[PDB]
Amino acid sequence: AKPKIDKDFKGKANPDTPRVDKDTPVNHQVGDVVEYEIVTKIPALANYATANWSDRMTEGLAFNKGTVKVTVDDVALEAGDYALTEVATGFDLKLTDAGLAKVNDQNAEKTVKITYSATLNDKAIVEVPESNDVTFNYGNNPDHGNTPKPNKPNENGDLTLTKTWVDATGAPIPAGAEATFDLVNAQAGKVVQTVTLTTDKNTVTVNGLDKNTEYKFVERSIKGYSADYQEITTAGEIAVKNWKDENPKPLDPTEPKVVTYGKKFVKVNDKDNRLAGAEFVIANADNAGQYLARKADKVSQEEKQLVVTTKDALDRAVAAYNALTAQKEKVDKAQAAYNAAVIAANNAFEWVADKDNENVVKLVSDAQGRFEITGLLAGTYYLEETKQPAGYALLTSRQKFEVTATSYSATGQGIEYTAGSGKDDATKVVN
Numbered sequence: 138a139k140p141k142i143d144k145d146f147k148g149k150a151n152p153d154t155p156r157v158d159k160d161t162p163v164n165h166q167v168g169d170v171v172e173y174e175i176v177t178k179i180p181a182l183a184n185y186a187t188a189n190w191s192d193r194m195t196e197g198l199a200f201n202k203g204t205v206k207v208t209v210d211d212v213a214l215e216a217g218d219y220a221l222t223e224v225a226t227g228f229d230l231k232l233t234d235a236g237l238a239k240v241n242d243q244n245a246e247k248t249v250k251i252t253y254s255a256t257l258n259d260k261a262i263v264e265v266p267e268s269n270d271v272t273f274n275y276g277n278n279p280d281h282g283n284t285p286k287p288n289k290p291n292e293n294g295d296l297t298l299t300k301t302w303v304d305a306t307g308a309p310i311p312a313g314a315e316a317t318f319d320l321v322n323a324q325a326g327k328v329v330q331t332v333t334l335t336t337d338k339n340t341v342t343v344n345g346l347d348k349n350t351e352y353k354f355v356e357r358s359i360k361g362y363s364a365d366y367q368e369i370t371t372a373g374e375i376a377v378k379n380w381k382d383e384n385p386k387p388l389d390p391t392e393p394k395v396v397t398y399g400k401k402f403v404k405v406n407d408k409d410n411r412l413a414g415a416e417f418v419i420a421n422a423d424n425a426g427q428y429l430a431r432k433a434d435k436v437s438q439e440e441k442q443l444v445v446t447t448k449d450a451l452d453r454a455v456a457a458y459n460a461l462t463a464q465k466e467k468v469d470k471a472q473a474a475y476n477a478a479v480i481a482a483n484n485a486f487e488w489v490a491d492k493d494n495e496n497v498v499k500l501v502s503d504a505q506g507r508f509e510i511t512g513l514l515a516g517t518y519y520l521e522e523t524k525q526p527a528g529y530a531l532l533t534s535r536q537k538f539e540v541t542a543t544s545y546s547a548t549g550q551g552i553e554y555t556a557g558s559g560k561d562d563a564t565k566v567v568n
């Protein structure tokens with residue numbers, strides 16, 4: 138009777154028997170190309186006027202335009218069978234009359250498969266998942282529904298919902314019913330707040346949200362109305378239009394999640410004094426092996442140049458600081474600028490045999506001894522010091538560290554990343 142849907146990583150999707158652990162994010166490294174598949178079962182003897190799929194992704198996943206492929210019963214559709222619209226944050230794929238004829242009026246269940254990919258990018262934050270979000274909007278009447286578009290709150294934590302209503306022709310009409318929405322953290326898929334719009338007030342502001350987190354208002358199905366989520370035009374505002382299409386509720390599968398990991402370090406001496414200007418690379422073995430580098434063909438000339446120029450300025454700041462008596466915030470700022478340039482340039486990682494390779498990632502301690510690495514797979518890695526802090530001997534041994542699902546954030550480690558934090562969330566490196 139009703140169609141069935143699932144979305145998962147390529148090869149895992151199963152509309153009949155969806156995977157049990159979907160909610161648990163799968164560890165990837167920055168630059169990974171994540172392959173997705175949507176599988177939809179359409180019943181025999183269907184007579185749909187609309188069969189539309191739409192997907193929107195959180196900002197750390199860059200939809201790869203041109204990667205969409207669609208098959209029915211493992212047979213490729215023709216260009217004329219669907220209308221595909223691609224945007225920075227995803228796509229909409231709508232069957233034309235020609236495409237509908239291939240899933241309608243069939244004597245057996247039809248299986249639609251849509252595959253595509255997205256690239257995990259440098260906007261991803263360690264331990265915060267990234268996600269897509271597919272909705273299948275269908276019915277015997279034309280349907281105007283689509284998938285939610287995630288959005289961040291305004292600077293002060295406010296996110297506002299506005300709802301309007303139209304008939305099947307697009308003409309405004311009064312609210313047809315009370316409308317309930319679940320405000321969902323779009324990264325993790327957890328509901329944070331439920332709101333209800335009465336028939337006389339079509340807007341509501343939710344306060345206290347995280348300005349660096351994406352959310353979405355997911356409409357609970359209202360009988361005979363389809364939810365058309367408007368493109369995002371500004372932070373802190375989400376608009377929804379309800380069409381009186383008189384179609385069934387849409388299909389809304391449980392999407393998988395991806396996540397990257399990281400590690401924090403503090404450079405100190407034997408008295409726990411924090412040291413600026415120590416430089417390190419990362420190796421994949423306790424001796425020999427390879428070193429962590431950004432992939433040269435995935436980084437622009439401008440991105441590479443910024444790493445170099447900010448490093449030069451950091452070198453100058455470290456020099457000027459080291460000249461000061463015990464009795465510079467300049468170092469911290471310069472180091473943060475360099476760190477930001479490194480993150481922006483680290484679009485993808487690879488392992489290289491030559492530690493002198495110009496693309497090898499180089500970490501530098503600030504005036505609080507701090508340095509860090511983000512965007513990694515879990516594993517056992519090894520720091521190698523390449524430049525000692527002024528006045529100290531070069532370390533001779535590599536230092537083992539473990540990257541895990543909580544290694545960036547957890548206490549129970551060597552030292553406070555930032556003194557006084559109360560969290561021992563960094564690896565201690567002693568000079």
Ligand code: NA
Nearest residue numbers: 270271389390
């Ligand atoms: Na969905």
